[PDB]
Design a protein around this motif. Structure first.
Motif, PDB file in Angstrom:
ATOM      1  N   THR A 182     -41.276  18.992  24.944  1.00 37.71           N
ATOM      2  CA  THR A 182     -40.373  18.302  25.855  1.00 37.71           C
ATOM      3  C   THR A 182     -39.002  18.996  25.941  1.00 37.71           C
ATOM      4  OG1 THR A 182     -41.543  16.238  25.732  1.00 37.71           O
ATOM      5  CG2 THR A 182     -39.254  16.146  26.446  1.00 37.71           C
ATOM      6  N   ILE A 183     -38.426  19.371  24.793  1.00 37.16           N
ATOM      7  CA  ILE A 183     -37.165  20.117  24.805  1.00 37.16           C
ATOM      8  C   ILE A 183     -37.378  21.404  25.618  1.00 37.16           C
ATOM      9  CG2 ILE A 183     -35.344  21.232  23.413  1.00 37.16           C
ATOM     10  CD1 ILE A 183     -35.371  18.209  23.335  1.00 37.16           C
ATOM     11  N   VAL A 184     -38.431  22.162  25.323  1.00 39.26           N
ATOM     12  CA  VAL A 184     -38.717  23.402  26.069  1.00 39.26           C
ATOM     13  C   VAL A 184     -38.744  23.208  27.611  1.00 39.26           C
ATOM     14  CG1 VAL A 184     -40.433  25.205  26.550  1.00 39.26           C
ATOM     15  CG2 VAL A 184     -39.952  24.588  24.196  1.00 39.26           C
ATOM     16  N   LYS A 185     -39.573  22.285  28.086  1.00 42.94           N
ATOM     17  CA  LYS A 185     -39.693  22.067  29.528  1.00 42.94           C
ATOM     18  C   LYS A 185     -38.356  21.615  30.096  1.00 42.94           C
ATOM     19  CE  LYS A 185     -41.993  18.472  31.136  1.00 42.94           C
ATOM     20  NZ  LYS A 185     -40.625  17.893  31.230  1.00 42.94           N
ATOM     21  N   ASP A 186     -37.608  20.799  29.371  1.00 41.13           N
ATOM     22  CA  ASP A 186     -36.361  20.292  29.881  1.00 41.13           C
ATOM     23  C   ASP A 186     -35.178  21.253  29.812  1.00 41.13           C
ATOM     24  OD1 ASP A 186     -37.776  18.026  30.500  1.00 41.13           O
ATOM     25  OD2 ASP A 186     -36.867  16.814  28.898  1.00 41.13           O
ATOM     26  N   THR A 187     -35.361  22.391  29.181  1.00 43.12           N
ATOM     27  CA  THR A 187     -34.287  23.348  29.067  1.00 43.12           C
ATOM     28  C   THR A 187     -34.653  24.659  29.753  1.00 43.12           C
ATOM     29  OG1 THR A 187     -35.098  24.106  26.880  1.00 43.12           O
ATOM     30  CG2 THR A 187     -33.345  22.435  26.884  1.00 43.12           C
ATOM     31  N   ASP A 188     -35.843  24.782  30.376  1.00 33.47           N
ATOM     32  CA  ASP A 188     -36.160  25.962  31.156  1.00 33.47           C
ATOM     33  C   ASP A 188     -35.060  26.331  32.187  1.00 33.47           C
ATOM     34  OD1 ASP A 188     -38.246  28.119  31.578  1.00 33.47           O
ATOM     35  OD2 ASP A 188     -38.188  27.355  33.612  1.00 33.47           O
ATOM     36  N   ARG A 189     -34.414  25.330  32.807  1.00 34.54           N
ATOM     37  CA  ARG A 189     -33.212  25.541  33.630  1.00 34.54           C
ATOM     38  C   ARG A 189     -32.148  24.620  33.222  1.00 34.54           C
ATOM     39  NH1 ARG A 189     -34.410  28.796  37.977  1.00 34.54           N
ATOM     40  NH2 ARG A 189     -36.618  29.194  38.332  1.00 34.54           N
ATOM     41  N   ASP A 190     -30.941  24.924  33.686  1.00 38.47           N
ATOM     42  CA  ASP A 190     -29.809  24.122  33.421  1.00 38.47           C
ATOM     43  C   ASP A 190     -30.220  22.729  33.798  1.00 38.47           C
ATOM     44  OD1 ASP A 190     -28.433  26.525  32.972  1.00 38.47           O
ATOM     45  OD2 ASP A 190     -27.037  26.242  34.619  1.00 38.47           O
ATOM     46  N   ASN A 191     -30.082  21.832  32.851  1.00 35.73           N
ATOM     47  CA  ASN A 191     -30.441  20.455  33.038  1.00 35.73           C
ATOM     48  C   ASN A 191     -29.222  19.712  32.728  1.00 35.73           C
ATOM     49  OD1 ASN A 191     -31.326  17.830  32.759  1.00 35.73           O
ATOM     50  ND2 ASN A 191     -33.068  18.343  31.453  1.00 35.73           N
ATOM     51  N   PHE A 192     -28.636  19.059  33.741  1.00 29.56           N
ATOM     52  CA  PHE A 192     -27.441  18.256  33.621  1.00 29.56           C
ATOM     53  C   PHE A 192     -27.748  16.771  33.445  1.00 29.56           C
ATOM     54  CE2 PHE A 192     -23.969  21.145  34.882  1.00 29.56           C
ATOM     55  CZ  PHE A 192     -24.678  22.180  35.508  1.00 29.56           C
ATOM     56  N   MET A 193     -26.913  16.111  32.653  1.00 25.80           N
ATOM     57  CA  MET A 193     -27.072  14.671  32.334  1.00 25.80           C
ATOM     58  C   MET A 193     -25.751  13.962  32.242  1.00 25.80           C
ATOM     59  SD  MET A 193     -29.862  14.653  29.241  1.00 25.80           S
ATOM     60  CE  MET A 193     -31.020  15.945  29.152  1.00 25.80           C
ATOM     61  N   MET A 194     -25.723  12.744  32.750  1.00 25.75           N
ATOM     62  CA  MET A 194     -24.626  11.878  32.486  1.00 25.75           C
ATOM     63  C   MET A 194     -24.745  11.334  31.055  1.00 25.75           C
ATOM     64  SD  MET A 194     -22.796  12.398  35.149  1.00 25.75           S
ATOM     65  CE  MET A 194     -22.546  12.561  36.928  1.00 25.75           C
ATOM     66  N   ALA A 195     -23.738  10.641  30.630  1.00 26.06           N
ATOM     67  CA  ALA A 195     -23.629  10.143  29.270  1.00 26.06           C
ATOM     68  C   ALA A 195     -24.772   9.164  28.876  1.00 26.06           C
ATOM     69  CB  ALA A 195     -22.282   9.497  29.100  1.00 26.06           C
ATOM     70  N   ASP A 196     -25.163   8.306  29.822  1.00 25.20           N
ATOM     71  CA  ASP A 196     -26.163   7.259  29.573  1.00 25.20           C
ATOM     72  C   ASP A 196     -27.461   7.937  29.505  1.00 25.20           C
ATOM     73  OD1 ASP A 196     -24.728   4.813  29.540  1.00 25.20           O
ATOM     74  OD2 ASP A 196     -24.920   4.558  31.706  1.00 25.20           O
TER      75      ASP A 196
END
Lengths: 190, 189, 192, 194, 193, 184, 184, 193, 194, 192
Positions: free
Chosen positions: A156-170
């Motif tokens: 999950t970390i791998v797939k979610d970091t393949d590109r810049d992944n932006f997130m709000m605080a929540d």
């Protein structure tokens, strides 16, 4: 206006360090990383049981330098509570995520961003290969670090970091990069 | 700056009438494409006569250069190659890639072989993609040199790991060329 | 000012620049720095003139501080390879690769005008990298150094060791001195 | 398909016949601006060309130059002495340093200046950086050149050596009449008719 | 890009650049700065025209801010040397060496169009080095200044004193003023007047 | 900076709970404001903090850290515009303590939508566009909350640069009061 | 972000507890500063350990060897601790710490390689400089072999190109003696 | 940033930069290039230490590629002038003027740590201008070269001829070699040996 | 709260007491490097300061300079003559051009050089671009300065004017013993003990 | 080399830089170019010294090529406004605004050291724009020119026309010449 003001018997940062507040502000490089480390080691020798409050606003930067802050956060005796006060991007997100279990914050409007490592090299095919291999290790290691502090499975970390992944605080709370999002000092905790 | 004129031809165009083509200086898209066009023209004029491809190059871009190499193999004519200075990197590959038995150097030429050079910046995933790619290119350049030299693939890898400079006589011994020529009158041939 | 033109009346008109016009008289120039472009253009003229007439001398006028050794050594070899004698004539400076080219002209047919400056030296180079590669390039330039000293020894008749001693630092010579050393055959002041 | 006429070629290879080409037909050759390997070699080519066209006709070498590279310029000087034709020299603006050498190098009695020209003689300029050994090599070399150029000027002007040395230690500017008195030129000329 | 004109030399046919075409009518331009390049080109044209015919007038059109004194004095001296009369015509600007060239044209044949600007001044120069060498160059520029003032005096008919005073700083004149001053002989507005 | 040894001018004024944001908003200027606010809080958590602003904005993330700190801390952060409050600078002015957002008469106040920029693969272009649109939305929502205006109004009114004088900025609810003299 | 006070600056405070940093490039300035600190600490007490914290990509060999020599010369054991990066002269200095007292944090990058150099000029002089760097290459390899326990021919093979090791790999290889995840 | 050390002057208390603290133990550094700035600072420290006590040894630590000859010769001459013996210690590099400074320390008190690089050469210079002035500067650099060779001969015990031969090109020596050559007196590895 | 000691101030205003401050207590003043308005004014301030502290104690002015601005430097020369205290001068590396002027400007019998110093004298250098009028103004001015500086050197060395003129036409390098023989200094000194 | 420090022993310690230390002796320097920063710092010292003692002279040492006329004229006015006499002393160069400042010192109390160079000139300026604005700025500099000539006339005693004639081009003067002209009162060589 722009320079550190002073207090009675100290610049402002020195006054806040007295309450165990440490800032990482701007880019992570050898200079900025070393200064946070001198500060963590120092607070630890002043009192190795009191919590430290590491306030982060950074776009990341150099991995070797930042992983020093990360390592030092884990090594020293005090808990290092993190709080994102603007941006926590790249190495900056990793450091946020790396704060003590339960003790990672973000202010409401902060931005969190996670990605894979950037690098770069020019030379012989043999050396390019050496350098690529190494960056692939570091990529794996940093994903392993995020999987540990987040609760996510590695894949999950791998797939979610393949590109810049932006997130709000929540969204960052929900994902496991932080534990609380806080809005007023008087408000109840969550 | 000024190319002499003869009869109405520029000196390179006049030598082109005797089937002589030059690579001079760096290999890049411009300079490769000019050789490719001259080779296609020479074939068009006569697909059976030999073409004499004089090389003085420190090398340059591999993609550009492999177009010349392939064109030399593709066209009907035999492309004799002749080192008149330097044949390094893509230069030495082109020199080695000339027609069986028709790869020459003048006595004082330097020939240098090495592995490819490259450069990429970005994400780790893309560094991996470009690294895999230049490794394939390294291996194939190596096979190309083993083929034309008659050396073992291991031997080429080992002798190209770092810049390897050869004099004319050494380049012959190695199989990069067939003959060192000092004088037009003298043998053989 | 740029190179002028000569019009030749034909059965209409034809235009040549002055250098093109002199090439018709078997005159070739090397002027300024030796690099890939300059050397190659001499080589083409030389091959051209051989093709036009393999038996008549060429007159190769030299005014050069030298430059790139690999480019220059193509010119030197081309000079020996072709059938015509290449007579060399120093018309200002012949330094470094310029003095090698002058010296490599055909036996007896190496000339300087009287006020020319002739200089001989060991090569110059430069590399930055790993100690392994530094060593490789240092070995190489030393082998180049030796080869060029052997060329000069050959055309001058001096012992190689004399060449080595005399090129260890820049060695400037007047035309009469260059003749005495065997770098050229004749100093010429006037056409008759 | 006759050859186009222009005032001036944009490039050496241009297939056009310019004003300079026109005048080279009349045996006129210019040195204009700095003496460098390019400008000096062009003069030389034109002198050898003119000699090949006719070895027994005067050449008119019009000089407007501040000088420049001594080795380049000494190839011009030499070529002018080597060819059979007389090389008349004319100053048409400035003849300084290697420029004045070339002017004073003209054929005996055929060295001219227009009336407003500036003629300047001096010692050579050089520059070297490196080890002390090599500095001494280059200094010794420029001193021999200084002495050789002084002997040339002595020869053509009729001044003795020790006068040329004295008068070239520092920049020495001369008007046309003065240059004629000194023997750098033979005639100052004001109009074709005189 | 310079336009081309094709003429039937009969021949049959030759291309001229617009400037070489006008050269056939003995017109020559100085346009822009006076420097070794521009001066020499002009002097080549002048010598060429004199070879073509030594008696026919030459028409030298000037639009220049001046520039180098040695280069421009070659032009001046060539104007005076050659047999033909060199008519001068100001067609925009004649400043500094430009105005000296305009004023040195053949007597009675120096013209300006009505809107041109003519400006006269003293020479400019500069030097750095030893005091000894500063002196040499200063003495030399003072000789130059004097010789140029004497040339302007000769062609204008003004006293040398007046030239000196009027060139101490930039002195701008309209065409009609320049005529009155002696720097040109006529102001011309229309071909058929 | 005028200078006694053992205060500079800013240090003295910090002793009166006066803080300045002067010039561009960036990681350096934002952080120093955050440090001062937190210090001021520790010294007395009830007395008002006077936050003087003169700024064209700058980095959103840096400034939104300052925004958040202003909301988080105990004491009221009064905002006073003293020349320019544009872009992130107006967001910070509009974020002051309700009832305690001031401007001197001559100031200029400007609101707009976010600026950004990005170069790369389409995929990455998409990601970054997607994010700046969220930020746009979030800042409109903040302006909407602090002025009383409808999200819809804010969206129309910030589409291009919108310059307001002090009276207009009050009327709009970006400030609460225009002050001209001490005696009022 | 500049150096806090605690009266000392924080590095000066850590110096009093026998802590020295090399951070960033080894050059004459940074190397001399370490040398000065070591000499000072030895002067203060010649028997107490010194803690030399390293995060360096290396730099100038001669400057670096001065540090190395000083570390061996003075009476105190100099413990070395890698706290981000230890490359080229960095790893040499890490590996040159006191026997049994060489550490790394778990995520440090350690890299070993042959020296880098270059020269332009006459062939004779290129040769002098080439022979010189070949001596320095052999000396450094001998120093690494001494402190790691590897055979010289192993060091030579493994430093021909950049050799990146993780902290556990560096320990097995003998460039450090311990990886420390936590305590004080 | 330079670390600070606080000492109880009793007083009560004074801050020193790490370098001024070491100055209290008569240690002085030349680090980096020799130039007017670095040379003068060293010469000031030397003069200061001599004023503090004219008999106590001074410890001059050298890590330098050399640089300007005039600046460095001031340092050399000040070492010889002052009363205290100036021990020299190479702590990385002593090249060119650096090695001259190392070799000019007090007899028997010139040291190197074991890994230092000592290099000796002939001077470098350069000049551009008139041939007359080229000559003046050449003669002057040859005098400098000779005087520097004579200094090295004096402090090494080598013949002047040998110095001349061994400085014609860059000559790199290991510490033990430099000791053998006479440029230093001891190589030291450990404080307690 | 005693004043920190450093080797060297980073900035003019730094509240620290450096090596130069230490030596100024001993009445030692340095001119190091180029003579410009900054460096020359600092010397002047220190000389006026020392004179205010004690008008009857020697000042030791240590010189290592290639020279520079003549007007800046002539303010130093003047101040050295104007103050009551004797200003001893010591060459510690280079005294060239305005540097050598200042050294030879020291108090009678109190002008020194360390043994390896280089001392060079020459004529002034200048530069001007503009109208011929203004060129003549600046040339006349540099000639007066040349003559004034020559008279100064004549005064302090005891050479007559025509010798100073001859010997400064071109750069003139002297070793310490030579400078002493010429009267630029009084003593060459090798160690404090002699 | 940077400005040194003097330690003053107090009842602990106090540090002053040398210029701060001389300011205590009522010495003020103008050194180098006149600009906003340099002029203002002189003005502050002048106001400071007046406040410390309105009646004791100030010694204003001048080594300046001039610079910005508006900045310089603040210093000149401040000099006349304050109560203390400002004695001026030229210690190298006083050119352009530097010579105006020197000249504007108090009557009888204008000094030069003997080797100083004093130069007077008309102002320099520069503008680019519309002919309308060119005219505005040309009128202005001419009015400035006139004002500065009037200042010099006043302090020297020369007729304004003489000032005009003598500043039309750069006019360099030696100290004795500057005294004769009325730009200063005394050339001083030695303190007694």
């Amino acid at each position: 206006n722009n320079l550190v003001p002073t207090v009675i018997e100290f610049d402002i940062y020195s006054r806040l360090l007295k309450e165990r507040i440490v800032f990482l502000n701007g880019e992570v490089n050898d200079h900025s990383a070393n200064l946070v480390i001198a500060q963590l080691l120092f607070l630890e020798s002043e009192d190795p049981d009191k919590d430290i409050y590491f306030y982060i606003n950074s776009p990341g930067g150099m991995v070797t330098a930042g992983m020093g802050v990360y390592d030092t956060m884990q090594f020293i005796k005090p808990d290092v509570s993190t709080i994102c006060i603007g941006l926590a991007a790249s190495m900056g997100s990793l450091l946020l995520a790396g704060g003590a279990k339960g003790k990672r914050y973000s202010l409401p409007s902060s931005q969190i961003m996670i990605h894979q490592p950037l690098g770069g090299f020019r030379g012989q095919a043999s050396d390019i290969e050496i350098h690529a291999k190494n960056i692939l290790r570091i990529k794996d290691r940093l994903n392993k670090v995020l999987a540990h502090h987040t609760g996510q499975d590695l894949e999950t970390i791998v797939k979610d970091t393949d590109r810049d992944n932006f997130m709000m605080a929540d969204e960052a709370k929900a994902y496991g990069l932080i534990d609380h999002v806080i809005e007023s000092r008087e408000a109840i905790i969550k």
